[PDB]
Amino acid sequence: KRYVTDRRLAETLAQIYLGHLLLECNPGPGILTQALLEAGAKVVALESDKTFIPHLESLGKNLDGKLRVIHCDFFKLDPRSGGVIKPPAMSSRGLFKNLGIEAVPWTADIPLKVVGMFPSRGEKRALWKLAYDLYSCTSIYKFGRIEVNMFIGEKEFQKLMADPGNPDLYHVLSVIWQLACEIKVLHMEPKLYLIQMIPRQNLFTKNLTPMNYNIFFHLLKHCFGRRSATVIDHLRSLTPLDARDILMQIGKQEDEKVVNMHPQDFKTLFETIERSKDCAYKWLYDET
Amino acid sequence: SSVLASSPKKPVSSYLRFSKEQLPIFKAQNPDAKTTELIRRIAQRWRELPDSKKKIYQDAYRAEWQVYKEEISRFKEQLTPSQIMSLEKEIMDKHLKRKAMTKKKELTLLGKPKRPRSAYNVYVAERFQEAKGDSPQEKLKTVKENWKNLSDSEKELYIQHAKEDETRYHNEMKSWEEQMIEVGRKDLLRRT
Amino acid sequence: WAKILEKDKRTQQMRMQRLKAKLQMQLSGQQQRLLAFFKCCLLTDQLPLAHHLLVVHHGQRQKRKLLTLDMYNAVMLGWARQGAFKELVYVLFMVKDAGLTPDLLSYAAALQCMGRQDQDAGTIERCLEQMSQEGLKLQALFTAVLLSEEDRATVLKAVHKVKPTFSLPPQLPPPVNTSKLLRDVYAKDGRVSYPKLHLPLKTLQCLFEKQLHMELASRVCVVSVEKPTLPSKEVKHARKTLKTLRDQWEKALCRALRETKNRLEREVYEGRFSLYPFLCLLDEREVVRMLLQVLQALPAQGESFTTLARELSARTFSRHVVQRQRVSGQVQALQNHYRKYLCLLASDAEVPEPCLPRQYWEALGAPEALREQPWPLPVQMELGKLLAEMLVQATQMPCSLDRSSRLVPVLYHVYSFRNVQQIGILKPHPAYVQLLEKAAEPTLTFEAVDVPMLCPPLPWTSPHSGAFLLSPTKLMRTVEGATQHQELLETCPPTALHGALDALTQLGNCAWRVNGRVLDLVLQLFQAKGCPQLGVPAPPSEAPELAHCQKVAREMHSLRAEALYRLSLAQHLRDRVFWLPHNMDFRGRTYPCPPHFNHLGSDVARALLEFAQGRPLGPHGLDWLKIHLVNLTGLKKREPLRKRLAFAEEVMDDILDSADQPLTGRKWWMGAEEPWQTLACCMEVANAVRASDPAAYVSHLPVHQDGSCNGLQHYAALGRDSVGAASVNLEPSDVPQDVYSGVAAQVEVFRRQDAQRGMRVAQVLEGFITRKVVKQTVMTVVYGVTRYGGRLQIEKRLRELSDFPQEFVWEASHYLVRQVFKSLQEMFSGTRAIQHWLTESARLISHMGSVVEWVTPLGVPVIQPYRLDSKVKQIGGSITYTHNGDISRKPNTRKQKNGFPPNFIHSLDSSHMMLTALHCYRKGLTFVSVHDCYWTHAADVSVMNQVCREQFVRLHSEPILQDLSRFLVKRFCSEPQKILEASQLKETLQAVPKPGAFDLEQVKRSTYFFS
DNA sequence: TGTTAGTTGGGGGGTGACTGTTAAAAGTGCATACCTATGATAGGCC
DNA sequence: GGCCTATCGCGGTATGCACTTTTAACAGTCACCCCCCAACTAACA
């Protein structure tokens, strides 16, 4: 995997994160952990490789304070449709219960901060999993708007930050994450981008709720299935309502292309369809 | 207000350049010959022209194609969305007009009996020449008035000839439509 | 006026001159498309179209290479059939100009045109002498060329003009199979007593006419067993709206069909290929009716776009075959032939000499009408996409549902991304779904191929003639490797398949009827309140956080649908006698063709059916009915037969009470292991004991005799394993030997060791190792390692064990399978030797890039179809559905190696079943087969057991392992290079495990071998 | 029952074709890449 | 041979490559066709 092995980078990161409780993912050799402890941070290390645990614990014993080392793979927490049968895999409810972290309302401020690096070959998987957890208000996001800072590759970074301004890289994950969080580049290490993802307070609305996000994901995947086609073409396969009327409601013309729609255009589209009043049903969603 | 007219056009190719420069000379030396023969002799001149001479025109065409690349690039990047839409509309409409003209002119090329002449058409054809009037419109209105003032007995010959042309058109329609069936074009037959 | 008229005339004449001037001026997918187009044009008689396309292709440099001699032969045969001598000569000119060589089919076309046109004996003679100089054979024309009876007649007429004394070979003397095991089946030496049906000849002719009408219509309308209550206004309004909408869709589909045929026709006028003639193969009214039927039957949840294309393609092909036979006179010849065939089965008719249905059928004729080869897969796919897209585009409906100006498509395709690769799906409009739900249509429609036949099926005479009278049916169900298995079924000697054909014909000839009382009760529960405890699905009213409730609701709806169809067909066949034609898989296992209603179904399904022809109980019929009853109850599985009979005598009062008052009495039957079958057996026993003479009661209820772990029986027989023979009741004993109990014990000791080691799954499985769990588990490992069809059933059986933590059910099923494997291999070391021998041999055979092939002891060739990596995709404006062509590159070594032993065992049990059926038929017994179970009348259970044991001993008495080893040696150890792999392969094949001491003859004396 | 368009004839005016070659644009058949998502043994690579 | 890695109707969409058809590029003259005038009507929907 990826591990922070440079001391200078560890110090720079320590000053950035210090800028509360810090959850460090996959510390490995523990250079970043030691930099945080020297900088005065309160650290819980979620180490996926048990071989790294002793030294880290020793370092903690050097401080002998509130540092806590757990044998846990953050990217395998709470498996979807799983039987909960693994030591490295855990439940965020039990982990946070042991760490004494209490849930706060969505509107409340950031209760906890998680930092680390995406897997070198699992960036898309991790982004999708965290997206599901975020929009579903499960896992860590059951406790509030958790701030997540992660190192990511340049390709997935550009794809994540793309928009109609850069149509070739605009994708579903771009829409989901740009709507979900205010993403900001905190550091660039040659290329790896340390991205800060803070969930937006106003993500959920009267018509976009943790109860109907799945229909929105279905709409996004469906639309990006044929990115070159017209929006009305896809709408004719998603709702019995007048597709031209909806598109006009969201201020788009009939010839509007999918790649030209902004994330807020997608969100206002979904909310507009959900808002319809005089119909027995608004969506055609029926999939296992 | 036509974007297509201001769009940079493709440069003239080597041969077409040679013809564009030779044609005025051949026309000066042969003012009465038909353009057909001059273009033919110019093409033969091009075929007889040594490759080393054509190469000059080819190089000129290539440089003109580079400058055309720059011009078309800047132009396309300069067009606003509405201008792209109007250009697409002009392109589509022009294509539709091409199809309409080709199809109608085709239908005219196919030798088919003209539709039947009415008694009024017959009367206009017989009396137009002697009808007073300063223009064909005024003479046609005159023929219209004199027709409206005609009695039923004065019209008997024109109606008879109209019927006879009806039978003529019927028969010639049968024969021709059959001949079109031979050519495998049953779409031109009367529908029902 | 003569001036103007003459001007018009002159212009017209000049126009005529202008008219004179205008008149003066290695198989491949595309090759498959073109050839299919040309062959298709012969059936629609659109010869000028195909000739136009062929000429265009020939005239182009790059297109001429695409043409093939077979195509030129196709157009040539078309012109020969039309008598266009000049155009046929022109085609011969194209053939000669393209070089290449003319063939027998070409000369047959020329002879056809000369005979039809009555050419001179000089031209015919000259043609026959040019054919003689070319080296072609006169007799090879009538034999090697596929020609209709009209082509044969015309060619004969042409030949008889020059050579009047030319006679075809004397035919048709059929040859008899000389197989070791079928010898006494086909030998005339012996007293045969083939059974006859209870229906008279005229009755069988009326039923044959009914079935013929049903197949000609291609549809079956059955009254629904639903719709007990109905709203007064809602159903009326929804029905009026639905009828109007169906008229609108009918008209719109007609117009769209004509417009599409026109478009494709113009595309043929251009240099492009199109499916025009394929749409001209079937009546437009039939196409519209088929599309409307598919729309009416489309599931509310939707159907895969590709799957729907396939279905439309299959129904199109079927209706085209039916139409062709209809218009080609094959129907009349089938009527005469079948009407003569019915003499063998009818009670009031006799035949000159006794014979099997296939033998008699071939004896009467046997022209067998004509065989039509199916279309290439790309044609099927493109046609399906055409019909589907046409239906979607043509069908519109207003969105207002329950002032409907707006129009939206009735069908809309949406996308499922569950599989990482999105697949197109066709979903109906929800307003349409609610419309059909409110309408509550009281009728259901089935395909004629999906319901039982109203007359005895056609005897299986070849791998392409069988089952329903007109509709073509494959001899082997297996779709994967269908080309290989079919081509090898036609490659093997025709006599080799005699046994299988006669067995399948025998199974199909079994007359069935519905149990009125059982149907009345099952419907009474279904029509009112369902009974999940008795396998009767409950209506949606009884459906029960939200996600779980929706899941349970969907499952209950599925089961409700299946039961609706099955019980509806049962009600339709209430007062009728019907037959179920049988089919085979690649392993040889037989399965009924009608899937909805057949004896292979659940307990309810098995209880709804009984033999149409009865059999007097005799001296032991009643005892066999009681023993069968106890077996169905499952209360005395371990007890001997005498104690089962005594127990039946004990609970006789509960039997009579259960029969008389099933739902109001003591309801004892509901406690049995098979409640509905047990109840039926109680009714039969009641009728028997309450009859004046129980020995003379004509009993119709079938009695079952099952082989416990038949696979382990075959392995114990192959290796002569005494421990195995004892475990699986091959060795005689007064009490039944339960291998599941011993295996459960050994697995219990292993579980004690692993549980002592601290393993979690072994700790949680403590006290759960039961007979049923290990019965289904062993039945899994024997019948199948991997491909978790049975594994899922085991998971279900564990999930129904309330006291088990459902988190380990998956891991617990895997662990149980592994422990059963290890245990069986420990207590049955010889079995491990045979299994490892076959497995390794298959591994080495497949490792050389060749699939494992063998021949059953009855002469049936079996080939494993597991292959991978064949794909090509079309694109209709624009989904791009993929397709798996029949051309395979590499075999799947894993599936082959794991599959060889169990598949071979399948061929062994199938061969045993077939021998039992064939020999039981000679004694006049009614025999049907469900997986391992053999059924017969209570009057003949003893005789059936005798035939079973005799045929088992005879089967395994041959050197099956030796013959198989030598077979694989000859077939796969012949490659001259490399020789090393053939030396290791031979080294493993000749390592046949030595047999044990067990005396196979003891099977003849084992009472509980099959019980 | 309502809409189209082709004749009846002339005269003025806009417009495609015929003579030619060059190559840029653009329509076929095929192989390929992507998007996303989750404990034993056999094959492939070094 | 030894060690490491992937696995238990592959999906539809859209991109580069080898080929072949279509057209936009230059121009002078001659024939056409459009329109108008109104009316009439065979043909089509």
Whether A172 and A87 share a structural domain: yes
Buried b vs exposed e over C70-81: b needs ≥16 C-beta within 10 Å? ebbbbbbbbbbb
Cα–Cα nearest to C378, from C620, C30, C87: C30
Query: What range does the domain containing B67 cover?
Result: 3-78
Give C886's contacts (C-beta < 8 A, 6+ positions apart). Answer: C377, C482, C483, C870
List all residues of chain C from 426 to 455 with a beta carbon under 8 Å from chain A: 427, 429-431, 434
Give B176's contacts (C-beta < 8 A, 6+ positions apart). Answer: B111, B112, B113
Cis peptide before C104 (omega within 30 of 0): no
Whether B72 and B124 share a structural domain: no
Whether A226 and A141 share a structural domain: no
Whether A106 and A245 share a structural domain: no
- A69 DSSP β-pair partners: A45
Residue B35 to residues B19, B23, B26, C720, Cα–Cα distance (Å): 12, 9, 9, 103
CATH number of residue B167's parent domain: 1.10.30.10
* H-helix or E-strand spanning residue C32: helix C29-44
Please give the radius of gyration of chain C, using alpha carbons only, rounded to the nearest integer: 33
- C219 DSSP β-pair partners: C447
Whether A162 and A252 share a structural domain: no
Task: State which residue of chain A sits closest to C425, comparing Cα positions.
Answer: A287
Whether B7 and B66 share a structural domain: yes
Helices (H), chain A: 7-18, 31-39, 53-63, 92-99, 123-136, 154-161, 172-180, 213-225, 231-235, 243-249, 263-275
Q: After which residues is chain A broken (C to N over 2.5 A)?
A: 19, 190
CATH number of residue A75's parent domain: 3.40.50.150
- Tokens representing residue C430 in the block: 């929800």
Cα–Cα nearest to A148, from A188, A115, A186, A120: A115
The domain boundary residue, chosen from A199, A226, A254:
A199
Cα–Cα nearest to C587, from C451, C711, C708: C711
- Tokens representing residue C59 in the block: 């005239």
CA atoms of C185 and C176, how far apart (whole Å)? 10
Whether A191 and A218 share a structural domain: no
Resolution in angstroms comes to 4.5
Whether A149 and A31 share a structural domain: yes
Q: What method did the depositors use to determine the structure?
A: X-ray
* Residue B167, φ and ψ in degrees, nearest 5: -65, -45
Whether residue A37 lies inside any domain: the answer is: yes
C578-579 and C615-616: which strand pairing? unpaired
Whether residue B126 lies inside any domain: the answer is: yes
The beta-carbon neighbor of C416 closest among A85, A236, A287 is A287
How is B37-63 classified by DSSP, letter by letter?
A: HHHHHHHHHHHHS-HHHHHHHHHHHHH
CA atoms of A195 and A157, how far apart (whole Å)? 8
Please give the radius of gyration of chain A, using alpha carbons only, rounded to the nearest integer: 21
Whether residue B40 lies inside any domain: the answer is: yes
Distance of C1' in E12 from CA in C872, Å: 12
Strands (E), C641-796: 698-699, 703-705
Whether A128 and A237 share a structural domain: no
Chosen from C304, C417, C554 to mutate, greatest number of chain A CBs within 10 A: C417
Q: Assign residue C47 a region: left if phi > 0, alpha if psi is -120 to 50, beta otherwise?
A: alpha
**Is the separation of the CB atoms in C830 and C985 below 8 Å?**
no
* H-helix or E-strand spanning residue C408: strand C407-409
Q: Looking at beta carbons, which residues of chain B come within 8 Å of C12?
A: 111, 113, 172
Q: Looking at beta carbons, which residues of chain C come within 8 Å of B114?
A: 8
* H-helix or E-strand spanning residue A195: strand A192-199
Q: Assign residue A28 a region: left if phi > 0, alpha if psi is -120 to 50, beta otherwise?
A: left
Distance of C1' in D18 from CA in C20, Å: 22
Cα–Cα nearest to C716, from C945, C856, C909: C909
CA atoms of A138 and A214, how far apart (whole Å)? 14
Distance of C1' in D33 from CA in C420, Å: 15
User: Does the annotation place A189 within a ligand binding site?
Assistant: no
The domain boundary residue, chosen from A169, A199, A229:
A199
How many structural domains are present in chain B? 2
CA atoms of C966 and A81, how far apart (whole Å)? 51
Strands (E), C49-176: none
Whether residue A288 lies inside any domain: the answer is: no
Residue B176 to residues B55, B110, C387, Cα–Cα distance (Å): 54, 10, 37
Whether A136 and A85 share a structural domain: yes
Whether residue B136 lies inside any domain: the answer is: yes
**Is the separation of the CB atoms in A39 and A24 below 8 Å?**
no
Whether residue A28 lies inside any domain: the answer is: yes
A21-25 and A42-47: which strand pairing? parallel
Chains in contact with A, where contact means 3 or more Cβ–Cβ distances below 8 Å, are C
Residue B90 near chain C (CB below 8 Å): no
**Is the separation of the CB atoms in C565 and C596 below 8 Å?**
yes
> A287 and C408 in contact by Cβ < 8 A?
no
CA distance A78 to chain C (A): 15
Chains in contact with B, where contact means 3 or more Cβ–Cβ distances below 8 Å, are C
Q: Please give the distance of CA C423 from its chain centroid, rounded to a whole number.
A: 27
Q: How buried is residue C285: exposed, middle or buried, by Cβ count under 10 Å (0-12/13-18/19+)?
A: exposed
CATH number of residue A255's parent domain: 1.10.8.100
Cα–Cα nearest to B38, from B19, B53, B51: B19
Whether A23 and A134 share a structural domain: yes
Task: State which residue of chain A sits closest to C429, comparing Cα positions.
Answer: A240
Whether A55 and A155 share a structural domain: yes
Whether B71 and B10 share a structural domain: yes
Whether residue B28 lies inside any domain: the answer is: yes
Q: Please give the distance of CA A177 from its chain centroid, rounded to a whole number.
A: 7
The full set of domains in chain C, from first to last, is 29-162 (no CATH), 201-396+407-473 (1.10.1320), 722-827 (1.10.150.20), 839-1005 (no CATH)
Q: What is the dihedral of CA C791, C797, C802, C805, to 10 degrees?
A: -10
Whether residue B163 lies inside any domain: the answer is: yes
Give C824's contacts (C-beta < 8 A, 6+ positions apart). Answer: C712, C743, C778, C781, C831, C832
Buried b vs exposed e over C798-822: b needs ≥16 C-beta within 10 Å? beeeeebeeebbeebbbbbbebbbe
Whether residue B107 lies inside any domain: the answer is: no
Q: Please give the distance of CA A145 from its chain centroid, rounded to a whole number.
A: 11
Whether residue B23 lies inside any domain: the answer is: yes
**Is the separation of the CB atoms in C840 and C968 below 8 Å?**
no
The domain boundary residue, chosen from B21, B50, B78:
B78
Give strand D nucleotides closer than 7 A to any protein Cβ.
6-11, 16-25, 29-30, 35-38, 42-43
- Tokens representing residue B178 in the block: 């059959």
The domain boundary residue, chosen from B58, B78, B98:
B78
Cα–Cα nearest to C712, from C697, C735, C731, C694: C731
SS3 C554: helix
Whether residue A287 lies inside any domain: the answer is: no
CA atoms of A177 and A198, how far apart (whole Å)? 10
**Is the separation of the CB atoms in C158 and C85 below 8 Å?**
no
Length of chain C equals 1011
- Tokens representing residue A154 in the block: 């340049």
**Is the separation of the CB atoms in C636 and C220 below 8 Å?**
no
Whether residue A130 lies inside any domain: the answer is: yes
How many structural domains are present in chain A? 2
Whether A185 and A125 share a structural domain: yes
Please report where in the chains the tokens 């519109």 appear, as a residue: C396
Residue C553 near chain A (CB below 8 Å): no
- C883 DSSP β-pair partners: C872
Whether A63 and A172 share a structural domain: yes
- DSSP structural state of residue C289: H
Whether residue B174 lies inside any domain: the answer is: yes
Whether residue A1 lies inside any domain: the answer is: no
Residue C907 to residues C479, C590, C856, C901, C956, Cα–Cα distance (Å): 18, 11, 6, 10, 12
Please report where in the chains the tokens 């291609």 appear, as a residue: C218
SS3 C892: coil
Residue C597 to residues C273, C592, C608, C937, Cα–Cα distance (Å): 43, 9, 10, 21
Query: What range does the domain containing A67 cover?
Result: 7-199
Buried b vs exposed e over C13-48: b needs ≥16 C-beta within 10 Å? eeeeeeeeeeeeeeeeeebbbbbbbbbbbbbbebbe
C303-304 and C458-462: which strand pairing? unpaired
CA distance C13 to chain B (A): 9
The domain boundary residue, chosen from A156, A171, A199:
A199
CA atoms of C839 and C899, how far apart (whole Å)? 8
User: Does the annotation place A148 within a ligand binding site?
Assistant: no
